[PDB]
RNA sequence: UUUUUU
RNA sequence: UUUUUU
RNA sequence: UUUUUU
């Protein structure tokens, strides 16, 4: 009937060439961003570079673009040829890299030596050195390193530098998974994930970061889109990798696994919990108007281009389509099943005003009732007899006590 | 029988070459609209330009065309090369852009310097400067900025300008979604949507707009078709974009998602709620005379050219075809189901005089009765037994209390 | 005719 | 809109 | 996250 037309209509509303678009945007005011490169593998140079960039991260009065450049440098230090990695950042718009080359710091504290190919102004060095010591008062020692001793210690061996740099890089990395989300919340979530890598040994607690620097890195990550684009490509490259790999990319991918779906949490939780745990209510003939939306949304996520696993991290209009408000009722039902099945999900926030309490209570009661609705054509694969089905349901009822 | 002829007839009534017409209209009295361009990326110049345009927005005695030009300039400031964007506005009729070029304001408050290529009259500068301070008495501080301090503060760095300009642009943008609709209503709807972006951080509350300026922008958007055409292309371009994008177009698309279907609300709500939630009544053999109309309307919306998602925003005769009055009875039924299922829809207005109360009450009773009409050939995909169907219906009945 | 919602 | 979890 | 066993 006309229902076929309605279904094709609803899908067509969701296929307005939104998924794949490999085109540039109209040009926009860029930001002159000054970035520095270390061609030689000198470990002392890169160590001083890491310390300098971390200083600039906490530079209180620094220009935003200065923080962007310091961040991009930081994320690019581990690379052998930093020229190539610096090049990749420019592949995105909003990138106007004033790529500079410094063979190394002067024997002064943070005084710099520009190289012949890429030079700068004397006022540049003066302002950068001024920016080198602007540190938050809440931070106790001048260094963000909590141990407050290693920053003084040098390293002339590539191995020691690699360990220190990897540790600091993962320090910064772990904060990404909470970028643009629950920033005002103190570090109640990352420490578990951080401590895991710590006792994995692939992290070092002897070189760790103070919480204030952590939150400053959080702020810088949110404020600067350039670093966001860079983190995207870094992670996209990491995923495509095989088993054998270097230390750094291996760690990056390992953390990125659950870094990815930082958003869509409502969507993923809803889809999983509802459309999987289909006991009683999913067939109601009143959820169709949202099931069509859900199917279209799945098609969207498949045909975005596999980058959708980073939609929240890359603030884009697609989230507005991936919105629970589009499908309030199935959302209510899924929240109902989740608040019963998991224990941690109880700690999750579901304060969307459009939520229908009626369907929410429907979900809760279905979860606490249908526990043990065995009978399926799938169930008969095991071959159990109906007497066995009754036995199973009764056994569930025995432990149903303790509510 | 003849019924085939009737159906083809009714569709043919709806296919009079109404959908796609890439042709110009007969020429009409245009409006000399004076617009200004800033080729250099100077941030102070563009900041002063933004302040000036916002002044002219609230210019009480200004010529309508003056407000049109100020608006178009405002919407075009973020672009790198504003020449190109100014060119696009002229692609529509009713566009007679007196495109002017000003390298920057004079050291006076708002005194202007025209450039050699595009000059004007001295009386032009005099009148524009006079128009610069005409401000509504209801506005407290001279500036529309509620904080009333940043307008004095300068900015010589492109980043600061970009942040300020984006914030102001979204300030203006969010009011578009209510253009030509519920204008007399105070800002009871936009604040939720605005505050969302605010705590998204992509907006800044430190630079926000007073409600009077908001309503003046509303008025200007309604009165001037040129800005409407410009907003259309801006949004049409935004939609076709891919994942990676600049800040500004990303925000524009993100808001435009639900900016789009600003009209057809009756149609979309009706089609969704009725033709989806088909429990009892949809098959009645008395809704056919409107179901044919509905199918034809769906074909119209598909074959308009995907721009139909902006039919209300682009006041066009097609709305008169997309009229509930064409299909009063299915409208009654859908309003009936909606007033039961959603809670917010209760706040919606459905005061069309042609509404049949009988079918409305039919819809209401069907919604409150058929809740839980499980049995479908689709329902059997889950494989539940009729005993399970009775269990589900009874369980719904248990929570049916609380009406 | 247009009036919520996300 | 975004808010756990691994 | 990883923690026996053969």
Residue numbers in the entry:
A (entry chain A), B (entry chain A): 3 to 405
Please give the exact wording used by the authors of the publication that reports this structure.
N self-assembles into a helical capsid that accommodates the RNA genome to form a nucleocapsid, which protects the viral genome from host nucleases and serves as the template for viral replication. Both genome transcription and replication are carried out by the viral RNA-dependent RNA polymerase L and require the phosphoprotein P that bridges between the nucleocapsid and the polymerase. On the structural level, MuV nucleocapsids are templates for both viral transcription and replication.
Here, we isolated the authentic MuV nucleocapsids from stressed cells. After 1 h of 0.5 mM As(III) treatment, the isolated nucleocapsids were curved, similar to their intracellular morphology at early time points of stress but straightened on addition of the RNA-mimicking molecule heparin. The two maps exhibited distinctly different helical parameters: a 5.58 nm long-pitch structure constituting the majority class (77.7%) was resolved to 4.5 Å and a 4.70 nm short-pitch class (21.3%) was resolved to 6.3 Å. The RNA packaging of MuV follows the “rule of six,” i.e., six nucleotides per N subunit, and is coordinated by conserved residues from a loop containing Tyr350, Thr351, Arg354 in the upper CTD, and loop and helices containing Lys198, Arg194, Tyr260, Lys180 from the lower NTD. Interactions between subunits in consecutive turns of the nucleocapsid are mediated by the CTD-arm helix (a region succeeding the CTD), which inserts between the NTDs of two subunits in the upper turn. Within the same turn, domain swapping between the NTD arms (a region preceding the NTD) and CTD arms of consecutive subunits formed extensive contacts at the nucleocapsid lumen. Compared with the map of the majority class, density of this critical CTD-arm was missing in the map of the minority class indicating its high flexibility, as only full-length protein was detected by western blot analysis. In contrast, the loosely packed structure of the majority class exhibits higher exposure of the RNA on the nucleocapsid surface and higher likelihood for the unresolved C-terminal IDR of N protein to extend and interact with partner proteins, i.e., P and L, at the nucleocapsid surface.
